[PDB]
């Protein structure tokens, strides 16, 4: 997250931190996700496509920090790793950049909800906010594009929905963007998601309800003029989400 502000897990209690085991026992951060039900986290397929084996991954919930334990957190193995059959990688774009992780603990359990651990609602079918709507994004990704390190503390910021007609322009992303994608950005290009934020939530207030409108997917740079952040448009995948769960 370029710009924005620091936060803790209580503000975004559905945020999931996804890590990978290494040969030689290193554990590195991979991607954010969102708890949509006690046993299901949702995320981006591109996060996992190079290491598509479930035993390599660990999911944490209720965790506000990258390399220290947060009081109250729950740790899971991935019982099930579901990548979208129609995934494709463009030069920038990712199509169908959506994945599901089934989580179960060493003791064999799913998430118990708490002050630090809650679910996020999914949108109603094909129902998105108007462009110009402010939504919020969360993740452990870089604070600047040049940074080598990821922040140790979870961050969030605000970006505004951009119309497809507008994202569709050349000047912008041209045809790279599709109707199964959304674009969002700061009017000044002052704040954005960046590397490390992929798979995390884009949450919008919809009918007085906090709703998972998008999943951080791609962009050209972070926080640059005419290069919004691109998000998997969740309201176009509900049957996929419903079937595989």
Ligand X SMILES: COc1ncc(-c2nc(C(=O)NC(=N)N)c(N)nc2N)c(OC)n1
Shorter beta-carbon distance to ligand X: residue 176 or 197: 197
Check 34, 43, 46, 186 and give the catalytic one: 46
Check 193, 198, 217, 235 and give the catalytic one: 198
**Is 97 a residue of the active site?**
yes
Using DSSP, state whether 106 is helix, strand or coil: coil
Stretch that binds ligand X, among 5-13, 22-30, 64-72, 211-219 (CB under 6 A): 211-219
> Are the CB atoms for 215 and 43 separated by under 8 Å?
yes
The mark string for 157-196 relative to ligand X (x by CB under 6 A, - otherwise) is -----------------------------------xxxx-
Using DSSP, state whether 103 is helix, strand or coil: strand
What is the number of other CB atoms lying within 10 angstroms of the CB of residue 153?
Answer: 12
Of the residues 13, 32, 129, 229, which one makes contact with ligand X according to CB under 6 A: 229
Running DSSP on this structure, what letter comes out for residue 45? G
What is the number of other CB atoms lying within 10 angstroms of the CB of residue 82?
Answer: 22
Q: Nearest distance from residue 202's CB to ligand X, in Å?
A: 10
Residue 232 within binding range of ligand X, rule CB under 6 A: no
Shorter beta-carbon distance to ligand X: residue 62 or 199: 199
The pair of structure tokens assigned to 59 is 């999911």
**Is 198 a residue of the active site?**
yes
> Are the CB atoms for 17 and 140 separated by under 8 Å?
yes
Shorter beta-carbon distance to ligand X: residue 62 or 200: 200
Running DSSP on this structure, what letter comes out for residue 17? E
Residue 138 within binding range of ligand X, rule CB under 6 A: no
Burial code (b: 16+ CB inside 10 Å, e: under 16) for 186-195 equals beebebbbbe
- Residue 45 sits at φ, ψ, to 5 deg, of -55, -35
Of the residues 221, 225, 226, 242, which one makes contact with ligand X according to CB under 6 A: 221
Distance, in Å, from the CA atom of 74 to the CA atom of 20, rounded to the nearest integer, reads 16
**Is 46 a residue of the active site?**
yes
Of the residues 45, 138, 198, 213, which one makes contact with ligand X according to CB under 6 A: 198
- Contact set with ligand X (CB under 6 A): 192-195, 197-198, 216, 218-222, 229
The catalytic site residues sit at: 46, 97, 198
């Amino acid at each position: 997250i370029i710009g924005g502000e620091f936060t803790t897990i209580e503000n975004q209690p559905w945020f999931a931190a996804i890590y990978r085991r290494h040969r030689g026992g290193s554990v590195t951060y991979v991607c954010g996700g969102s708890l949509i039900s006690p046993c299901w986290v949702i995320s981006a397929t591109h996060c996992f496509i190079d290491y598509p084996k479930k035993e390599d991954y660990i999911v944490y919930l209720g965790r506000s920090r990258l390399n220290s334990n947060t009081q109250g957190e729950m740790k899971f193995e991935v019982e099930n790793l579901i990548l979208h059959k129609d995934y494709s990688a463009d030069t920038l774009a990712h199509h169908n950049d959506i994945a599901l992780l089934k989580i179960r603990s060493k003791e064999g359990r799913c998430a118990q909800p708490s002050r630090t651990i809650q679910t996020i609602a999914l949108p109603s079918m094909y129902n998105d906010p108007q462009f110009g709507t402010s939504c919020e994004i969360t993740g452990f990704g870089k604070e600047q594009s040049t940074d080598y390190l990821y922040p140790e503390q979870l961050k969030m910021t605000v970006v505004k929905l951009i119309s497809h007609r507008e994202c569709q322009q050349p000047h912008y992303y041209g045809s790279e963007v599709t109707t199964k994608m959304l674009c969002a950005a700061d009017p000044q290009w002052k704040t954005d998601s960046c590397q490390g934020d992929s798979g995390g939530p884009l949450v919008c207030s919809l009918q007085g309800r906090m709703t998972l409108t998008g999943i951080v997917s791609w962009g050209r740079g972070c926080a640059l003029k005419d290069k919004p952040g691109v998000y998997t448009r969740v309201s176009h995948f509900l049957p996929w989400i419903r079937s595989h769960t």
